[PDB]
Paper text:
The malaria merozoite protein apical membrane antigen 1 (AMA1) is critical for RBC invasion and is one of the most promising blood-stage vaccine candidates. AMA1 binds to RON2 through a surface exposed loop (RON2L) to anchor the parasite to the host cell membrane prior to internalization into a parasitophorous vacuole. Here, three single-component AMA1-RON2L immunogens were designed that retain the structure of the two-component AMA1-RON2L complex: one structure-based design (SBD1) and two insertion fusions. We determined the X-ray crystal structures of SBD1 and insertion fusion immunogens 2 and 3 to resolutions of 1.80 Å, 1.85 Å, and 2.10 Å, respectively.
We used structure-based design (SBD) to alter the location of the C-terminus, enabling seamless attachment of RON2L. The SBD1 immunogen is a circular permutation of AMA1 that contains a Gly/Ser linker (GGGGS × 4) between the original N- and C- termini. The DII loop (358-TDYEKIKEGFKNKNASMIKSAFLPTGAF-385) is removed in SBD1 to produce novel N- and C-termini at residues Lys386 and Thr357, respectively. This new AMA1 C-terminus is immediately adjacent to the N-terminal helix of bound RON2L. Some of the residues deleted in SBD1 (360-YEKIKEGFK-368) comprise a helix in AMA1, which is replaced by the N-terminal helix of RON2L (4-QQAKDIGAG-12). This design approach ensures that the RON2L sequence (3-TQQAKDIGAGPVASCFTTRMSPPQQICLNSVVNTALS-39) could be appended without a linker to create SBD1. The SBD1 structure was most similar to the AMA1-RON2L complex, with no major structural reorganization observed and a Cα root mean square deviation (RMSD) of 0.299 over 245 C-alpha residues. All groups had potent GIA against Plasmodium falciparum 3D7, and there were insignificant differences in IC50 among the AMA1 DI-DII, AMA1 DI-DII-RON2L complex and SBD1 immunogen groups. Strikingly, when the same pooled IgGs were tested with Plasmodium falciparum FVO and Plasmodium falciparum Dd2, only pooled IgGs from the AMA1 DI-DII-RON2L complex and SBD1 immunogen groups showed >50% inhibition at 5 mg/mL, and the IC50 for the SBD1 immunogen group was significantly lower (i.e., more potent) than that for the AMA1 DI-DII-RON2L complex group in both strains (P < 0.001). In conclusion, the single-component SBD1 immunogen elicited potent strain-transcending growth inhibition that was significantly better than that elicited by AMA1 DI-DII alone or the AMA1 DI-DII-RON2L complex despite lacking receptor blocking antibodies that prevent RON2L binding to AMA1.
Author numbering: 3 to 53, 77 to 364
The structure:
């Protein structure tokens, strides 16, 4: 459990729109200060959208350690036993708005299906390859029809439903049904993408290769809030069904995070200042600095299972469903062995 952040990190920022300063800090805020120059943001928040302690109830959703409970930039907060081997999995309770993965020196978008059949590893992305019946990608309307006879899921919010759908595929080696894949929901196309690869960062020169001529070598990649990801939500298996009320999403206009002390909201007494031209660029920096469950580079050298420690998952070609009716679903083609 050495790598788990449990949500601790530089998760919050006060963006001064007039001085173009992103004031980043790593303690939970406990009140808000009215100030027309400011917008209050968190690493989980959408990067653009804006809206004896009397603040306790209102500020609960900014207590990231309590309401999310895991990393943000890299979320690998739980372990799942499969056939005697313990794999790392995303486990945060809130959706991460605007997060995606950039594959370095690559044309491949990360929601492209993982390489299968005759494809080289670097030709494919992170998403589930086609299955029969087709499980991913699936649109919202398709998901509600798929689950139309399941009372407990059919009416879930679209993000919670995408999370539960991604969790509806049990690898056939996983007899205790512990392993649940993460997912990305694209609000533009209203599509749920189950992610076959649960890793989110691989940047060590000893463990990845950025050369495009070595197309079966492991590629390098990192999480980011790129402008092209603004409609995505990165979702672990644990996304809660009431995230809309308990998790952050919109940024707070005309508001500065503060700390409640002796009946008054005081300024955060020490912040780390980064320049940022607009709110999106501040949110991107807060995310870059936020809680991470990634092993530090020196820790990846000291382990004998570097791939597992960054989230490498089990080899699975056929699956069974968790929710009724029980059915078997197989990939149309097996994933590239290089994985």
């Amino acid at each position: 459990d050495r790598y788990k952040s449990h949500g601790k990190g530089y998760n919050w920022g006060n963006y001064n729109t007039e001085t173009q300063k992103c004031e980043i800090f790593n303690v939970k805020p406990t009140c808000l200060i009215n100030n027309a120059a400011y917008i209050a943001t968190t690493a989980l928040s959408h990067p653009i959208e804006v809206e004896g302690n009397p603040w306790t109830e209102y500020m609960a959703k900014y207590d990231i350690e309590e309401v999310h409970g895991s990393g943000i930039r890299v979320d690998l907060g739980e372990d799942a036993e499969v056939a005697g081997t313990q794999y790392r999995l995303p486990s945060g309770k809130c959706p991460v708005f605007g997060k995606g993965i950039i594959i370095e020196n690559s044309n491949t978008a990360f929601l492209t299906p993982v390489a299968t059949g005759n494809q080289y590893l670097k030709d494919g992305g992170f998403a589930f390859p086609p299955t029969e019946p087709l499980m991913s990608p699936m649109t919202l309307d398709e998901m509600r029809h798929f689950y139309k006879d399941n009372k407990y899921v059919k009416n879930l919010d679209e993000l919670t439903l995408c999370s539960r759908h991604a969790g509806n595929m049990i690898p056939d080696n996983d007899k205790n049904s512990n392993y649940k894949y993460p997912a990305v929901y694209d609000d533009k196309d209203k599509k749920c993408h189950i992610l076959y690869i649960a890793a989110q960062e691989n940047n060590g020169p000893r463990y990845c290769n950025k050369d495009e001529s070595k197309r079966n070598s492991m590629f390098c990649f990192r999480p980011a809030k790129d402008i092209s990801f603004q409609n995505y939500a990165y979702l672990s298996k644990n996304v809660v069904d009431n995230w809309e009320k308990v998790c952050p999403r919109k940024n707070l206009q005309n508001a500065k995070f503060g700390l409640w002390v002796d009946g008054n909201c005081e300024d955060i007494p020490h912040v780390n200042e980064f320049p940022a031209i607009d709110l999106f660029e501040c949110n991107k920096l807060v995310f870059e600095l936020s809680a991470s469950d990634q092993p530090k580079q020196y820790e990846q050298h000291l382990t004998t299972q570097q791939a597992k420690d960054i989230g490498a998952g089990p080899v699975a070609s056929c699956f069974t469903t968790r929710m009724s009716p029980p059915q078997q679903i197989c990939l149309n083609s097996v994933v590239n062995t290089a994985l």
